[PDB]
Backbone as numpy.savetxt, mean C-alpha at the origin, in Angstrom:
# Nx Ny Nz CAx CAy CAz Cx Cy Cz
-17.43 7.15 11.29 -16.32 7.43 12.80 -14.71 7.92 12.15
-14.56 7.61 10.96 -13.56 7.92 10.12 -13.93 9.42 8.85
-14.51 10.71 9.89 -14.69 11.64 8.55 -13.60 11.74 7.72
-12.58 12.29 8.42 -11.38 12.53 7.68 -10.73 11.93 6.49
-10.95 10.56 6.85 -11.09 9.10 5.70 -11.74 9.43 4.30
-12.78 9.00 5.12 -13.52 9.70 3.88 -13.52 10.23 3.22
-13.38 11.78 3.67 -13.30 13.20 2.75 -12.25 13.06 1.80
-11.29 12.24 2.22 -9.99 11.85 1.85 -10.58 11.24 0.10
-10.77 10.05 0.51 -11.01 9.26 -0.35 -11.79 9.95 -1.77
-12.59 10.81 -1.70 -13.45 11.86 -2.23 -12.46 12.61 -2.53
-11.92 13.32 -2.70 -10.97 14.28 -2.65 -9.76 14.09 -3.97
-9.44 12.48 -3.24 -8.84 12.14 -4.41 -8.86 11.54 -5.52
-10.27 11.68 -5.14 -11.05 10.92 -6.97 -11.52 12.02 -7.63
-11.95 13.18 -6.90 -12.13 14.60 -7.87 -10.84 14.54 -8.50
-10.07 14.82 -7.85 -8.43 15.00 -8.30 -8.05 14.33 -9.00
-7.81 13.38 -9.66 -7.42 12.55 -9.96 -8.31 12.34 -11.51
-8.83 12.43 -11.60 -10.44 12.31 -12.48 -10.38 13.60 -13.56
-9.67 15.04 -12.64 -9.09 16.03 -14.11 -7.54 15.66 -13.91
-6.71 15.55 -13.92 -6.02 15.45 -14.42 -5.41 14.44 -15.83
-4.92 15.36 -16.59 -4.54 15.01 -18.01 -3.67 13.43 -18.39
-4.68 12.57 -18.97 -4.00 12.06 -19.60 -2.75 11.65 -19.79
-2.12 12.22 -20.78 -0.62 12.36 -20.77 -0.02 12.64 -19.38
-0.33 13.80 -18.02 0.62 13.26 -17.27 0.48 12.24 -16.14
-1.06 11.38 -16.08 -0.88 10.39 -15.71 0.51 9.45 -15.93
-0.01 9.06 -17.19 1.21 8.17 -18.17 1.44 8.15 -17.58
2.35 9.84 -17.56 3.75 10.19 -17.61 4.16 9.94 -16.13
3.41 10.10 -15.20 3.16 9.56 -14.14 3.79 8.52 -13.44
3.31 7.43 -14.27 3.35 6.08 -14.26 4.35 5.27 -14.75
5.00 6.08 -15.82 6.50 5.47 -16.57 7.40 5.87 -15.05
7.80 7.03 -14.36 8.14 7.49 -13.44 8.18 6.30 -12.20
7.06 6.55 -12.13 6.78 5.44 -10.83 7.21 3.60 -11.71
7.00 3.34 -12.30 7.45 2.29 -13.37 8.82 2.46 -13.10
9.71 3.18 -13.27 11.58 3.16 -13.40 11.61 2.78 -12.66
11.11 3.53 -11.12 11.56 3.97 -10.04 11.86 2.41 -9.07
10.58 1.36 -9.25 10.23 0.23 -9.02 11.14 -0.21 -9.16
11.72 -0.52 -10.83 12.90 -1.03 -11.20 14.26 -0.88 -11.07
14.52 0.64 -11.02 15.63 0.66 -10.24 15.64 0.13 -8.52
14.40 0.01 -7.76 14.68 -0.19 -6.78 14.30 -1.92 -6.13
14.44 -2.36 -7.67 14.64 -3.65 -7.46 16.33 -4.35 -8.39
16.45 -3.11 -8.58 17.72 -3.37 -9.43 19.22 -2.69 -8.33
18.37 -1.98 -6.92 19.67 -1.48 -5.98 20.31 -0.21 -6.79
20.06 0.37 -7.04 20.34 1.94 -7.63 19.46 3.27 -7.36
17.74 2.37 -6.72 17.28 4.23 -6.02 18.18 4.36 -4.60
18.43 5.48 -4.09 18.50 6.01 -3.10 17.90 6.34 -2.13
18.01 6.87 -0.80 16.61 5.72 0.26 16.01 7.35 0.19
14.81 7.81 -0.86 13.83 8.49 -1.04 13.50 8.48 -2.16
11.90 9.32 -2.46 11.94 9.00 -3.88 12.77 9.85 -4.44
12.83 9.74 -5.98 13.36 10.88 -6.89 12.62 12.37 -6.81
13.39 13.35 -7.17 12.75 14.80 -7.10 11.88 14.60 -7.44
11.56 13.99 -8.85 10.74 14.49 -10.33 9.30 13.11 -10.03
9.18 12.72 -9.34 8.10 12.35 -9.37 6.75 12.82 -8.20
7.74 13.80 -7.14 6.84 14.87 -7.06 5.81 14.17 -6.29
5.86 13.09 -6.02 5.19 12.09 -4.26 6.07 12.20 -2.99
5.56 13.25 -2.13 6.18 13.44 -0.88 5.35 12.75 -0.24
6.42 12.01 0.69 5.58 11.86 2.39 4.43 12.92 2.47
3.36 11.52 2.56 2.15 12.39 3.07 0.79 12.22 1.77
1.45 12.83 0.73 0.70 12.49 -0.51 -0.38 11.15 -0.69
-1.39 11.13 -1.36 -2.85 10.27 -1.34 -2.46 9.62 -2.43
-1.95 8.62 -2.82 -2.00 7.72 -4.07 -3.04 6.81 -5.01
-4.30 6.98 -3.57 -5.35 6.36 -4.15 -6.22 5.70 -3.12
-7.41 4.41 -3.36 -7.47 3.84 -2.01 -7.53 2.20 -2.53
-7.59 1.94 -1.04 -8.03 -0.03 -1.23 -9.11 -0.48 -0.06
-9.83 -1.57 -1.59 -10.95 -2.51 -1.14 -10.91 -3.20 -0.60
-11.02 -4.04 0.62 -11.31 -5.43 1.04 -12.99 -5.69 1.44
-13.43 -6.86 0.48 -15.36 -6.30 0.50 -15.61 -7.17 1.28
-14.74 -8.57 2.17 -15.05 -9.31 3.16 -14.50 -9.00 4.24
-14.36 -7.32 4.59 -14.03 -7.18 5.15 -14.87 -5.85 5.38
-15.05 -4.89 4.71 -16.11 -3.78 4.41 -14.61 -2.83 4.76
-13.52 -3.62 4.19 -12.37 -1.68 4.21 -12.83 -0.92 2.97
-12.23 0.24 2.90 -12.09 1.35 2.21 -11.63 2.80 2.51
-10.19 2.53 2.26 -9.11 2.85 3.34 -8.38 4.55 1.92
-8.05 5.20 2.43 -6.78 5.92 1.13 -5.50 5.21 2.10
-5.06 5.54 0.59 -3.21 5.59 0.81 -1.87 6.27 0.61
-1.43 6.73 1.87 -0.61 7.55 1.85 0.39 6.86 1.18
1.62 8.13 1.15 3.18 7.24 1.01 4.12 8.02 1.84
4.37 6.89 2.19 5.04 6.97 3.68 4.55 6.66 4.76
5.45 6.65 6.03 5.05 5.47 7.45 5.59 6.61 8.52
5.40 7.56 8.24 6.51 8.62 9.36 5.15 8.39 11.08
5.29 8.45 11.93 3.85 8.58 12.62 3.24 9.95 12.12
3.61 10.93 11.84 2.19 11.26 11.79 1.22 11.31 10.04
1.92 10.40 9.72 0.63 9.74 8.65 0.15 8.88 8.75
0.32 7.92 9.45 0.20 6.70 10.54 -1.19 6.91 11.10
-1.13 7.94 11.95 -2.10 8.70 12.64 -3.13 8.82 12.01
-2.99 9.19 10.38 -3.84 9.57 9.58 -4.41 8.43 8.93
-3.70 7.35 8.67 -4.60 5.62 7.41 -2.91 5.58 7.06
-3.18 4.59 6.60 -2.80 3.22 5.80 -1.47 4.15 4.72
-0.01 3.44 5.26 0.78 4.20 4.37 2.03 2.87 3.43
2.39 3.56 2.36 3.33 2.61 1.80 4.40 2.77 2.82
4.96 1.94 3.16 6.55 1.32 3.92 7.52 1.88 2.87
8.66 2.71 3.28 9.54 3.63 2.74 11.08 2.56 2.12
10.99 1.81 0.70 12.17 1.41 0.21 10.85 0.48 -0.13
9.80 0.28 -0.33 9.56 -1.05 -0.61 8.00 -0.27 -2.34
8.13 -0.95 -2.95 7.11 -0.41 -3.99 6.23 0.26 -4.56
6.20 1.39 -5.07 4.72 1.65 -5.05 3.65 0.76 -5.68
2.49 1.04 -5.50 1.48 0.01 -5.82 0.95 0.03 -6.88
1.57 0.46 -7.76 1.02 0.31 -9.31 1.72 -0.97 -9.57
1.68 -2.37 -9.09 1.59 -4.01 -9.91 2.98 -3.62 -10.68
2.94 -4.75 -10.88 4.53 -5.16 -12.14 5.12 -6.36 -11.34
5.62 -6.99 -12.92 6.48 -8.03 -11.89 8.04 -7.65 -11.82
8.44 -8.29 -10.43 9.31 -7.94 -9.92 9.36 -6.92 -8.69
7.48 -6.39 -8.25 6.85 -5.70 -7.29 6.49 -6.05 -6.04
7.04 -5.06 -4.98 6.67 -5.74 -3.72 6.48 -4.48 -2.69
4.90 -4.33 -2.70 4.54 -3.03 -2.21 3.62 -3.20 -0.68
4.12 -2.73 0.56 4.10 -2.61 1.65 2.87 -1.45 2.69
2.06 -2.14 2.52 0.71 -0.99 3.27 0.67 -1.37 4.50
0.87 0.01 5.53 1.36 -0.12 7.03 0.06 0.47 7.58
-0.26 -0.21 8.65 -1.45 0.76 9.36 -1.05 0.36 11.36
-1.55 1.18 11.35 -1.26 1.49 12.98 -1.83 1.97 13.53
-3.07 1.28 14.00 -4.41 1.39 14.83 -3.98 2.35 15.92
-3.11 1.80 17.09 -2.69 2.51 17.75 -2.30 4.12 17.64
-2.10 4.64 16.98 -1.26 5.84 16.13 -2.56 6.54 15.77
-3.65 5.48 14.48 -4.85 5.97 14.23 -5.96 6.05 15.10
-6.08 5.04 16.17 -7.21 5.13 16.49 -8.62 5.23 15.65
-8.64 4.28 14.95 -9.11 3.59 13.97 -8.88 2.43 13.94
-9.68 1.43 13.68 -9.51 -0.06 13.26 -8.84 -0.56 12.13
-8.57 0.42 10.98 -8.25 0.75 9.70 -7.87 -0.93 9.07
-6.65 -1.56 9.40 -6.17 -3.29 8.98 -6.30 -4.27 10.29
-7.12 -3.46 10.68 -7.24 -4.34 12.46 -8.16 -6.00 11.85
-8.86 -6.06 11.04 -10.21 -6.80 10.70 -8.87 -7.93 9.69
-8.29 -7.69 8.96 -7.01 -8.76 8.19 -6.60 -9.72 8.97
-7.18 -9.65 10.27 -6.72 -10.83 11.00 -7.76 -12.16 10.61
-9.05 -11.65 9.84 -9.75 -12.92 9.49 -10.02 -13.21 8.18
-8.91 -12.98 7.69 -8.05 -12.67 5.48 -7.78 -14.26 5.78
-8.56 -14.95 5.42 -7.66 -16.18 4.68 -7.18 -16.86 3.21
-6.34 -17.46 2.96 -5.62 -17.91 1.85 -6.92 -17.92 0.80
-6.80 -17.01 -0.32 -7.97 -17.35 -1.30 -8.80 -15.17 -0.82
-8.37 -15.15 -0.16 -9.52 -13.85 -0.21 -8.53 -12.99 -0.99
-9.31 -11.90 -1.23 -9.35 -10.53 -2.23 -8.84 -9.56 -2.09
-8.40 -8.20 -2.30 -8.66 -6.88 -2.22 -7.96 -6.16 -3.58
-8.74 -4.71 -3.51 -8.32 -4.25 -4.64 -7.84 -2.99 -4.50
-6.96 -2.55 -5.07 -6.36 -1.41 -5.06 -6.82 -0.08 -5.84
-7.26 0.45 -5.90 -7.49 1.72 -6.95 -6.46 3.06 -6.52
-5.30 3.53 -7.55 -3.98 4.23 -7.34 -3.57 4.42 -8.59
-3.56 5.70 -8.64 -3.73 6.97 -10.25 -4.51 6.22 -10.81
-5.37 5.17 -11.22 -7.12 5.77 -12.61 -5.99 3.57 -12.32
-5.18 3.22 -11.78 -5.45 1.38 -11.87 -6.13 0.89 -11.28
-6.57 0.16 -11.38 -7.60 -1.01 -11.08 -6.55 -2.29 -10.66
-6.05 -2.57 -9.59 -5.61 -4.05 -9.77 -6.11 -4.82 -8.82
-6.51 -5.93 -8.50 -6.85 -7.09 -8.07 -5.50 -7.77 -6.82
-6.07 -8.33 -6.00 -4.68 -9.10 -5.81 -5.43 -10.51 -4.62
-4.76 -11.59 -3.87 -5.15 -12.84 -3.55 -4.77 -12.83 -2.32
-5.09 -13.60 -1.98 -3.89 -13.66 -0.68 -3.76 -14.89 -0.30
-1.90 -15.21 -0.39 -1.09 -16.66 -0.37 -0.22 -16.71 0.78
-0.23 -16.01 1.52 0.24 -15.97 2.97 0.37 -15.16 4.23
-0.52 -15.68 4.76 -0.22 -14.89 5.97 0.81 -15.83 7.17
1.40 -14.25 8.25 2.83 -14.42 9.14 2.27 -13.20 9.82
2.69 -14.05 11.04 2.71 -13.02 12.26 4.84 -12.74 12.58
4.93 -11.36 12.30 6.57 -10.78 12.89 6.98 -10.34 13.67
8.18 -10.71 13.90 8.34 -9.03 15.10 8.78 -7.82 14.31
8.45 -6.97 14.55 9.00 -5.23 13.98 10.20 -4.78 13.35
11.17 -5.85 13.60 12.14 -5.66 12.49 13.08 -6.89 12.06
11.79 -7.83 12.09 12.06 -8.80 10.86 11.43 -8.11 9.37
12.18 -8.93 8.57 12.53 -8.08 7.44 12.24 -8.98 6.24
12.37 -9.85 6.02 12.80 -10.77 5.15 11.67 -10.45 3.97
10.37 -10.91 4.67 8.94 -11.29 3.44 8.13 -9.89 3.03
9.11 -9.35 3.26 9.29 -8.15 2.78 9.87 -7.62 1.74
10.67 -8.96 1.30 11.13 -8.46 -0.05 10.69 -8.62 -1.18
11.65 -7.93 -2.42 10.95 -7.94 -3.65 11.32 -9.53 -3.80
9.90 -10.20 -4.53 10.05 -11.28 -4.53 10.89 -11.87 -6.75
11.96 -12.54 -7.55 11.75 -12.07 -8.58 10.60 -12.92 -9.22
9.92 -12.65 -10.46 8.99 -13.15 -11.40 8.05 -12.57 -10.46
7.77 -11.86 -9.42 5.72 -12.02 -8.92 5.80 -9.79 -9.06
4.62 -10.16 -8.64 3.46 -8.81 -8.51 2.97 -9.08 -7.10
3.95 -8.41 -5.77 2.96 -9.18 -4.30 2.84 -7.38 -4.04
1.83 -7.75 -3.34 1.45 -6.65 -1.82 1.12 -6.85 -0.69
1.99 -6.83 0.13 1.87 -6.91 1.62 0.64 -6.03 2.70
-0.29 -6.81 3.17 -0.69 -5.91 4.18 -0.35 -5.67 5.67
-0.26 -5.35 6.16 1.01 -5.18 7.90 -0.31 -4.04 8.56
-0.86 -4.89 9.56 -1.30 -4.21 10.87 -0.39 -4.68 12.25
0.01 -3.39 13.21 0.75 -3.95 14.43 -0.39 -5.02 14.93
0.29 -5.52 15.90 -0.74 -7.16 16.36 0.30 -7.24 17.69
-0.56 -8.09 18.09 -2.25 -8.53 18.19 -2.79 -6.66 18.98
-4.09 -6.79 18.91 -4.76 -5.34 19.11 -4.89 -5.25 20.45
-4.47 -3.81 20.20 -4.06 -3.16 21.01 -3.08 -3.45 21.91
-2.05 -4.23 21.85 -1.14 -4.61 21.75 0.80 -4.19 21.07
0.52 -4.15 19.47 1.11 -3.60 19.33 2.76 -3.93 19.09
3.08 -5.15 19.51 3.97 -6.05 19.89 4.90 -6.88 18.42
3.86 -7.22 17.72 4.47 -7.10 16.92 3.94 -7.07 15.01
4.00 -7.48 13.82 3.41 -7.51 12.83 3.03 -8.28 12.58
1.27 -8.66 12.02 0.79 -9.07 11.29 0.80 -8.87 9.86
1.86 -9.55 8.73 1.83 -9.63 7.77 0.11 -10.57 6.41
0.08 -9.70 5.09 -0.90 -10.79 4.87 -0.92 -10.32 3.44
-0.07 -11.35 2.81 0.38 -10.87 1.20 -0.81 -11.71 0.48
-0.38 -11.08 -0.41 -1.63 -11.11 -1.33 -1.11 -11.24 -3.26
-0.95 -11.44 -3.80 -0.67 -12.04 -5.63 -1.32 -11.44 -6.30
-1.39 -10.48 -7.56 -1.92 -10.28 -8.82 -2.63 -11.02 -8.92
-3.93 -10.72 -9.54 -4.48 -12.14 -9.86 -5.03 -11.51 -11.23
-4.88 -9.96 -11.81 -5.19 -9.76 -13.03 -4.07 -10.63 -13.48
-4.45 -10.42 -15.33 -2.61 -11.02 -16.17 -1.58 -10.05 -16.26
-1.20 -10.80 -16.61 0.32 -9.67 -16.35 0.11 -9.11 -18.47
């Protein structure tokens, strides 16, 4: 179905696989700084210039085995990027992990015309998903499922001492009048 996505994941892997260790290290450091700054209210409302992560860049992919999901993750959630796939929500942590982080990954199947995160409505507490982001392998386990209105925002905030990623899909299917949130907590050791 999703020709463009599959090709996207391939591109990303080849391309990250050929970036110099040093450069990957220095990029992760700058993301790590951003997330800390963001938890501390000192970020501005756009990524800092030197990350050279723009709206539309692909950062890696997500796998959810129990529901056969493997999708690229873009930065940003403007309508043109959500037409392509899952996007990191602006003002949330970039999904590299760490205490005091919470990345939100937004999927809109009404725009995308692809299932994307539709089946996250079958996940339950304890189910697992994996992120593959700038050479990091991260694992999360679901611990909160909630349906929420499109401008409700509280359960998307960073929690002190926690490493969270929320999966967000418009909901119910075909109607897109709410957001279903599926929050996972880091299951790798810190």
